[PDB]
Design a protein around this ligand. Structure first.
Ligand SMILES: CN(Cc1ccccc1)c1nc(Cl)nc2c1ncn2[C@@H]1O[C@H](COP(=O)(O)CP(=O)(O)O)[C@@H](O)[C@H]1O
Ligand SMILES: CN(Cc1ccccc1)c1nc(Cl)nc2c1ncn2[C@@H]1O[C@H](COP(=O)(O)CP(=O)(O)O)[C@@H](O)[C@H]1O
Ligand SMILES: [Ca+2]
Ligand SMILES: [Ca+2]
Ligand SMILES: [Zn+2]
Ligand SMILES: [Zn+2]
Ligand SMILES: [Zn+2]
Ligand SMILES: [Zn+2]
Lengths: 519, 519
């Protein structure tokens, strides 16, 4: 038997420092979690104990906090290099700052292979990106070799800005010939490492002949065997077992997000590279694990430059600003109401009364226990993308279809669920998709006293929304296709920041803007 | 036959200048109404035409605009004297600034008799107030005499600050011996002029033997025969006929409020002072009637001092601020929501989440068509009383009873109807009084994310409300009797003014805080 320990992270999203349990800024250091210093301690402890170890990342290191806004990936190359990651697969957020934002800060500076087998470069770009990422890497581990084959979401063109020169093939189509090539090179132990979501990961496990294990990301999937150590509810056992079409049991793993957990899988291989068994569980990187002092001091050095975004108080909150995915993708969330109220307040300076906002665009909560203080740093984790809040004119029919889209596949923690302003929507999830909106009232504009009236299909409404939605992001194709007017607006973070400074003390409530009917 | 023309006003409430149709500040002079200059023109036109005329006021000249805040009744004595009023009865708002606020500005300066037969002075006050008001006045009108007997609401001690030295008797008990005294003096034509409301007026007509006509006020009752000329819906025909217990047809009249109409009743008397017939209608004092130039110039002179309250823009509204009685005493009104939002914003600077406000305390709307400008003058007509917004701690049971009180006699345009903040109430008017509240949800305080939960009878809530309600005003005896804590707060007008200045542009909506169930 030959035992391999796979350590893995995914969707770290710029949480270089330790954080609160909800992955927002660490205030009470006594109960903080994650961060690269604490992760280092845990990894080193495992490397001391186990002779055959791989530390892998399944993408989306890019984007999430002021670390990325300021260092733009240089912090990722630096601290991943310091942690001695063995390999990384490209995620969609690695393309947020174009191909040049991936090439210069990360690809040219990483000391570990960066992988994607389903990304093919064309035109002038093909010439200089050659060699900076690889379809696979064969890694020596003890007296053996392990093949790692990469993959990135085929949907990346729609999720990010990878440009016109990169082609994203179907993951299964692209993976099979690379796995077959590795098998002809006598590599009998193969890990598929990539960034497409748990559903695609299970499909890769089922269909790509020769993959022994799948390490994934993108869906922030939490898997656990037994009693979970924190608030994340398991979506399945760890590892999640898939029976392949050629009859093999293939473990599929993922480790939630934000560096809160370290994924840990032990695989028992035979001499021909068959998986005899596997077991493990994600390790909660809580305060019981000490933060490595060398890494922590280097984090404290890089932290100096970021304190310009922490010293200015924009305002105060006396309520928890719930920007969690568990709230904002399933129900009305007070962070969504705050952001929509700021959006409407900004354009009103009777003009435009309605706001829609994809809940998945709210990327972090903000805690009120830090003497209620809100800084640019706190808001930057909520709104990291540098988008704008645009003015659009829609038909009632278009809006009805958008609200049907908001809940068409409700229950999967998808970002399309809409947060609102100037709208009172009631859904009935017992009804079929496309017919779940049972009430949709909107604030009148052509009235001297604003009040709620039923939306009319043949009428025209002005809505403030992110450019992400005006461009048909999150499958809101009907908005881009059917809109009547589209005016570009102010930068998202500046809109909210200005609103918080005007109000001084905020207390946004959940107040019945979105409801679900029991009957 | 001897014909008398009675001209009458009531509840003028400091509308010395002409106003908008809704009785708020005149902006578009082309369509403005009321005011003392326009009233003078109409009265003079009638005096030229009819030889036997009386111009009467049924109280509540005091309180309503910056005119009263600044001149404190000196403007009332002055312009009533200029209009040559023949008599006035004391209203409840004539006692708002104590007995000294009635005595010095008005009683010592009026050139016409001021009347009340059911007000008896005691102690040290009895000595100097003697003669300044009278129970009645016998007035020469041509070759005849007409007796006018006054009356003031027996409830004045609870509605105003008349002090401990004045006793308010039952109107009928006090009126009968004065009417009997007038009959022994061979006065066969008697007008009862007073300030108790249309219901008491009908009772006086029915029960006080010898009263030929009742001229009233206090309930802002609009009566009309035929098609009404503006937005006020008639409560009955003009005059309203009562058959007395001794078998006589007694006309009862009232002329709405704010000087928008001039009450006009022609009475045909026989030689023994029996009413043979009567007819008339309130005259809409609209732009077709020219404003008298002499009065208008004198109004413009007194106006100079008030322009200090008009030059400073506190902020802007882009919506009509509906502070009308027709909205605020019957349904959720956006002026109530604005005032409750300002009340909560002021104390929050999780602390206190709920607001209740008697709709009758909202004394005027504010128009948005004046380039949306809001001044101290505009807010002073909304909040003329100089009250405070106090913090109180109530049991859920107490709150439930207050909300039952808010709709116990719904439909009568009474001021107890509550406007709210941090409360979602649903009423069912088909149910019996005391059991009409079908839903009452309140914003949690002991929660990190505020949200609505059903009120609990045995729990404790902190509510911001006017001192008027904390003192059990508008029959909210349960608040004064059952409250657990009462802290005095900031001046009402300053709270709203400060909130408007912080927001800069306001757009309060009607948003479902108060609802009525159809079933
Ligand atoms: C501007 N920009 C990025 C971008 C778009 C185009 C061109 C360049 C850049 C975004 N803008 C906005 Cl508003 N919402 C977004 C965006 N990126 C994701 N999201 C949201 O995040 C949800 C997915 O979150 P997760 O479940 O954590 C997976 P992942 O971390 O891969 O995003 C989506 O369903 C969206 O709602
Ligand atoms: C402070 N103060 C006065 C006052 C109280 C006590 C001691 C000294 C002064 C008031 N405070 C407040 Cl908040 N609401 C009031 C008040 N005076 C009336 N109201 C309201 O106005 C309604 C009646 O209005 P109307 O139908 O037009 C008759 P009227 O014009 O006679 O008031 C009442 O039902 C109350 O809701
Ligand atoms: Ca194998
Ligand atoms: Ca008579
Ligand atoms: Zn991610
Ligand atoms: Zn992703
Ligand atoms: Zn009045
Ligand atoms: Zn009154």
């Amino acid at each position: 038997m030959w035992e391999l320990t796979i350590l893995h992270t995914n969707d770290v999203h710029s949480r270089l420092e330790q954080t609160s349990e909800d992955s927002s800024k660490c205030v009470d250091a006594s109960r903080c979690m994650g961060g690269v210093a604490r992760l280092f301690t845990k990894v080193q402890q495992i490397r001391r104990a186990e002779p055959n170890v791989l530390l892998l990342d399944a993408g989306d290191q890019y984007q999430g906090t002021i670390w990325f806004t300021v260092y733009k990936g240089a912090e990722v190359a630096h601290f991943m290099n310091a942690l001695r990651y063995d390999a990384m697969a490209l995620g969609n957020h690695e393309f947020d700052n174009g191909v040049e934002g991936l090439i210069e800060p990360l690809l040219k500076e990483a000391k570990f292979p960066i992988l994607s087998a389903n990304i093919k470069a064309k035109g002038p770009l093909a010439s200089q990106i050659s060699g900076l990422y690889l379809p696979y890497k064969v890694l020596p581990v003890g007296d053996e070799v392990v093949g790692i084959v990469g993959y990135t979401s085929k949907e990346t063109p729609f999720l990010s800005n990878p440009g016109t020169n990169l082609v994203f093939e179907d993951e299964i189509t692209a993976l099979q010939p690379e796995v077959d090539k590795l098998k002809t090179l006598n590599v009998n132990k193969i890990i598929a490492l990539g960034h497409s979501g748990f559903e695609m990961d299970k499909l890769i496990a089922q269909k790509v002949r020769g993959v022994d294990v799948v390490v994934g990301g993108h869906s922030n999937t939490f898997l656990y065997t037994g009693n979970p150590p924190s608030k994340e509810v398991p979506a399945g056992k760890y590892p999640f077992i898939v029976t392949s079409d050629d009859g093999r049991k293939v473990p599929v793993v993922q480790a939630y997000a934000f560096g809160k957990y370290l994924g840990y899988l032990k695989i028992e291989f035979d001499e021909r590279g068959n998986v005899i068994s596997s077991h493990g569980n994600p390790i909660l990187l809580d305060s019981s694990i000490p933060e490595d002092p060398s890494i922590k001091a280097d984090i404290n050095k890089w932290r100096i430059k970021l304190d310009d975004y922490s010293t200015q108080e924009l305002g105060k909150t006396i309520v928890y600003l719930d920007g969690s995915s568990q709230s904002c993708r399933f129900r009305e969330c007070n962070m969504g109401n705050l952001i929509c109220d700021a959006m409407i307040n900004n354009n009103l300076r009777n003009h435009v009364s309605m706001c829609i906002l994809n809940g998945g665009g709210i990327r972090s909560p903000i805690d009120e226990r830090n003497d209620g203080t809100i800084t640019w740093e706190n808001l930057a984790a909520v709104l990291p993308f540098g988008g704008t809040f645009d003015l659009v004119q829609l038909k009632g029919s278009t809006l009805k279809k958008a609200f049907e889209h908001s809940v068409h596949r409700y229950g999967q923690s998808t970002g399309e669920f809409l947060q609102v302003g100037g709208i009172h929507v009631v859904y009935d999830l017992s009804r079929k998709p496309g017919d779940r909106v049972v009430k949709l009232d909107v604030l009148c504009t052509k009235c001297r006293v604003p009040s709620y009236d039923p939306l009319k299909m043949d009428e025209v409404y002005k809505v403030i929304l992110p450019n992400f939605l005006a461009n048909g992001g999150d499958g809101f194709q009907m908005i881009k296709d059917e809109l009547l007017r589209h005016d570009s607006g102010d930068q998202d973070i500046n809109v909210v920041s200005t609103y918080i400074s005007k109000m001084k003390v905020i207390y946004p409530a959940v107040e019945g803007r979105i409801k679900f009917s029991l009957e």
